[PDB]
Structures are given as structure tokens and as C-alpha cells.
Amino acid sequence: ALLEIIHYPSKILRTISKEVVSFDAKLHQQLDDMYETMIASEGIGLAAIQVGLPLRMLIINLPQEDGVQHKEDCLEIINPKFIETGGSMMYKEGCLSVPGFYEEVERFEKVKIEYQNRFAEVKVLEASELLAVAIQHEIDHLNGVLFVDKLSILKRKKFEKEL
Ligand SMILES: [Co+2]
């Protein structure tokens, strides 16, 4: 089923999500709805609080060569945690919770996270470029952080203007 996406400046987006403990059918339905909702709004990433669920879980499905997304490449990241971080780069970002606005944000160029899939199976993932960016962006959501929070003084004004 489709879920309503929460938009800035809702305080719901400032919520600190909690660790997932029950990896059951209810959690799986939430993840399915999150995927259905993400694709319907044409997003590549989506955190649980973006649909009102204060759970530490997010999904990322980057489009490949053909430019299309394939449900098979969809990552379901739960209870994520950074093992290592490195580098620095500027990346222009967008967000389903901040429709219409895009701005450059400083991100680590390389990251390594540990997490669990929907079956509670521990996973380790190294990422760079777009995937590394999506991971950092989505994880920020779990901690109540939006990318417009990471804008420089100059760009933060450009945001308040386009508002
Ligand atoms: Co976002």
C-alpha cells in the first residue's frame, strides 16, 4: 500500500528513530510499503521516519546502466552503523521530504557500514560515490537530520529564498 510521505518543516522529521528488534512479517510489510511508496514518488532512497515510522531502517535502490531501477538491487538497511569513514566531497542532493530543492552537501567520499537485512542477517557494506552519499543521507534521517541542515551559510540562504 502507498504511505504518505512527510515533508519539511514537519517536526516528525526531527525524531530520533529506534533500533529494530522484531524482524517479522509486520516489519516486512512496512519495508514493502516503503518501497512501493518510494517508487511511486520516484525516489532512490527513503528512511522510515519519512513515512512516520520512527524505526532505524531505510531503503536504497539506485538505477543502473539502463537507467532503470530493479527491485533486486534494492538495499534494506536496518540498525545501520558506520565502521569506517573517509575522504570528503561535495554532492548535490535532493530529498522526497524536501521536494523541489537541490543543493550541494559535503559528504564522506567513502564509507563502510554494518547492518542487518530484513531477516536479521548481519551485513557489511563498503560504498563510494552515489551509494555512499545515499547511505549517509538516509542514515542522517534516522537521527533527525535533513540535508538542508548541512548547508553552508550561503546555500542556506538560497534555500530560504526558494521557500
Ligand atoms: Co531524504
CA 67-72-28 angle, 5° bins: 130
Q: Is 141 marked as binding a ligand?
A: yes
Find the domain containing 132 and state its range: 1-163
Q: Which amino acid is at 67?
A: G
Q: What nine digits make up the cell of 149?
A: 541542515
Distance 149 CA to ligand 1 centre (A): 12
Distance 138 CA to ligand 1 centre (A): 6
Domain of residue 71, CATH code: 3.90.45.10
State the structure-solving technique: X-ray
Tell me which residues are annotated as active site. Answer: 138
CB 13 within 8 A of CB 47: no
Environment class of residue 111 by beta-carbon count within 10 Å: exposed (0-12), middle (13-18) or buried (19+)? buried
Distance 99 CA to ligand 1 centre (A): 10
Distance, CA of 26 to CA of 32 (rounded, Å) = 10
Q: Is 7 marked as binding a ligand?
A: no
Number of domains making up the chain: 1
User: DSSP of 73-130, one letter per residue?
Assistant: G-EEEEEEEEEEEE--EEEEE--TTSTT--EEEEE-SEEEEEEE-TT--EEEEEEEHH
CB 6 within 8 A of CB 99: no
